[PDB]
């Protein structure tokens, strides 16, 4: 049994909401969830937290732009700000806990935020994990990542059932999928959400290329990668892994079946034990 | 410790000649090697075999055209007919062991003729483990694969050395090289294995089309595959285990580092742990 | 030993500062940087200025929109009125001089100003030299010109650094890499150069193709070109420099190796004895 | 003034029948002639011989299936073969001469055999440079090389003149000539020489793919090779020279005007020194 504390805590300019969880004496790992409406931390991690606080530091915060975190006084036009906030909000964060290296692990969004971070500051992390990560360049956008991108043209709740739906392999049988979606579909739709979310979205939509790490730069990195996608994943593409998967110094890929976007959730019953291996060791 | 036995065995109208190993009660495995001058199951997998052993009933054998396996009267020009009789060979091999239901491997040409074993007697076997296969259609065929083929028109030592080398990621450390190498090479040559081996990669080469499991048939296949790729394999492209992957019924695809076409002795350190545990449950 | 003169000079309409040095009575060349945050013509040629100074008299102008030159009043939304103001500060220049004819020598943006220079006032200019050149078309651009143009999204000094690496080939040795990066990135900050800086890269992204020379008229330029571009060059594709050295009447193409996009900084070894006898005869 | 030795040596199997010059004391560089009806070392090297020998000992073998050199028995069907040949005629001819290590240099299918060499045996070679090579990727074969090696299907003079001019940038011009033509038309209709020269060309045209070097090859070559390509080379496009200059460990690119497929010809004006230099150093 494990306690999940989760509150706010200073991460620099400004303050993030966190889950931590696990004995401040073992590794780090920094999990970073991915974007959409409604996400947040707890959404992306909450579930497996206790298995990884069994050896590790957990710390899972709320991206800036999402959750309780601070957010910004403006709101930036160009996506690359906000992933410019969100590697200065995880560094503060690891400052203020006084940790010096930590495993980081990043979903789709977050792998963006994760390749950004080990890119400017390698030193600081040891061994990384991406799953249906985006900081690659993309075939052919599939239709259900057009129709995420312009959910607020059309905020309604079936629409955003769907959404969801297409977020896992198996809908009907993903435990806590309609209180998910409920629950979820409030917040996003809050004023001050819809509000900052509209103009992020925008900023995700023409205007990701720029989020692409050079194939130099991947073939640099010192870390040892391990790649994750579901051989199902509706919103991102494999051609991302492939790509990270071809130019990175030391990587390996994994495709899980019977799994959609969030592998962590719907095959962490081999994902898991890998993770451990591949931090433990 | 474990004892081999490589012996003749009667599989039908030729006979094969077959490595060995386990006790019989426990399940079967059969370890289908690639093609290539002087290909053979030894080569392929005796260092890998006690492993497998210890939990399993091991058999690998010589396929027909290599080793010391039964050679055909008359010599097909035709690459399937070279298939077909494989095809036989393994299940006549399966019949004089008694083994009704067995777990299969096969890696680069011996994956063609696993695909084609489960297509045609689903279920003779349980469960299905692929490496760098070519049962797939290939995106263009790799300078190294090419120069493979047409090995006979000048079948000097150095060529064929710098042939063997781009198998594996790193030559100069693997153990056993210079003399897989020099021993191969003199084999490669017999006036009867050239023979046979010329005719085989003419056949190989340009007419392997035909070798294309139909996708339509890959996602009706009820076994679970493992599919297998070294991010450094010069040989067989990834494409090949991408298609396979894409379309089977239940797959999963684990592409390792600092692997080259030859996996399973490459990284046995990765995959050895990966096969008990597909095959085991 | 050469002293080099650094001041305002009046280059017509707008004043230029530039970087002079050398016997006004030897031929004249005119060295134009690229472009960039920071960018300025003491960055680009100080270093390799004393070497043709020996020979030539050497004329190096911050060209508008960079350095300390005069600053138009309105700043124009279209690149092409910024290239046209660059040209008319040159020959305003060279009329200043009273340089009737001079050889040019252009780097990667100020090789698009180069080319129009040569194509307007072809009595003007003898022989020319273009390195990592941008006036044509680019197959793809690469990550890093993208995110090269995106900087002032995320002006930070971690991003910076990373930018500037990516322009040699290897930042580690490269002599004054930390202070360059230091210095340039308090210039390229500071909120009046931020602020014409931000107008520039937003008309060279979605702008660039009106920079495009028409082969047409590469094919009549009666100069003698050398083309150079550096093997690792991650900012230029080699795309550009084989269409100019394709459709020239009279071109050289001289591909450097262990060489970025500031090939004069990096293999001055090879460019400077190359460029004096490419001037001298 | 330097004194050319041309005779027949003993180089292993088959003996070689070579231009010799310079004193055996200098370093040694060994000249590789490209293919075509009548083509032979003396063609291809003479007229800059002696400028090499000044510095370097020279050797210029007419490689098997040219010139005066000893033909094989029986007449190989596969390109392979013959290239095979050549390794081994190479090797064995800086044997006999007690060279142990020699620069090479390589024109279009000299190119291919230089490429096979210093990859068999990379410690007996220095310094490389190649010109309109071809041991690379063709985007589409030009009309004037399909023209070539179809010759025997029209083996008139005419034709010929036309073939030979093709090769150069300014046949008008070019000293030699029709000298040139009507002596090597001579001797490409030798009932002999066209007869092996016909199957040469039917094994060169459909067979030329297994000629390309893979790049991971090109890659691990450890010395520096200096490529050389006429802008108006009309038999070899420039993109094999290109494809090479991608993928070696260590390379540059030179494209020189006004000059052909004859580049050590054309331009020895600029292209002597630069081997000079690249030797020398």
Redesign the interface.
Same mark, same amino acid.
């Given at each position: 049994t494990v306690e999940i504390i989760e509150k706010r805590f200073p991460s620099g300019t400004l303050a993030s909401h966190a889950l931590v969880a696990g004995d401040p004496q073992s590794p780090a790992v920094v999990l970073l969830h991915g974007a959409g409406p409604g996400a947040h931390a707890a959404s992306n991690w909450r579930p497996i937290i206790p298995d990884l606080a069994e050896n590790f530091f957990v710390v899972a915060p709320d991206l800036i732009g999402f959750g309780q975190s601070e957010y910004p006084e403006t709101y #930036?036009g @160009?996506?690359?700000?906000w992933?410019?906030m969100r590697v =200065?909000q995880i560094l503060g964060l690891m400052n203020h806990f006084g940790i010096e290296k930590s495993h980081i692990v990043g979903n789709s969004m977050g792998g963006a935020v994760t390749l950004q971070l080990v890119?400017?500051?390698p030193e600081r992390f040891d061994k990384v994990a991406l799953m249906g990560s985006v900081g690659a360049p993309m075939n052919a956008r599939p239709p259900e990542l057009a129709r995420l991108l312009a959910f607020y043209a059309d905020p309604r709740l079936t629409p955003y059932r769907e959404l969801i739906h297409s977020f896992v392999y198996d809908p009907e049988n993903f435990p806590g999928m309609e209180e998910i979606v409920k629950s979820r579909f409030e917040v996003a739709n809050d004023p001050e959400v819809r509000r900052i979310q509209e103009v992020m979205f925008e900023s995700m939509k023409a205007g990701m =290329?720029?989020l692409?790490? #050079? #194939?130099?730069?991947l073939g640099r990195l010192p870390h040892d990668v391990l790649v994750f996608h579901g051989?199902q994943d509706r919103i991102v593409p494999?051609d991302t892994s492939?790509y990270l998967?071809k130019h990175l110094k @030391?990587? =390996?890929?994994?495709?899980?079946?019977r799994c959609g976007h969030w592998a962590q959730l719907e095959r962490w019953d081999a994902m898991g034990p890998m993770l451990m291996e591949h931090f433990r060791a």
């Open positions: #930036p @160009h996506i690359m700000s992933v410019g =200065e890119v400017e500051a =290329e720029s692409v790490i #050079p #194939p130099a730069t051989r494999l492939l998967t @030391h990587a =390996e890929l994994v495709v899980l079946d």
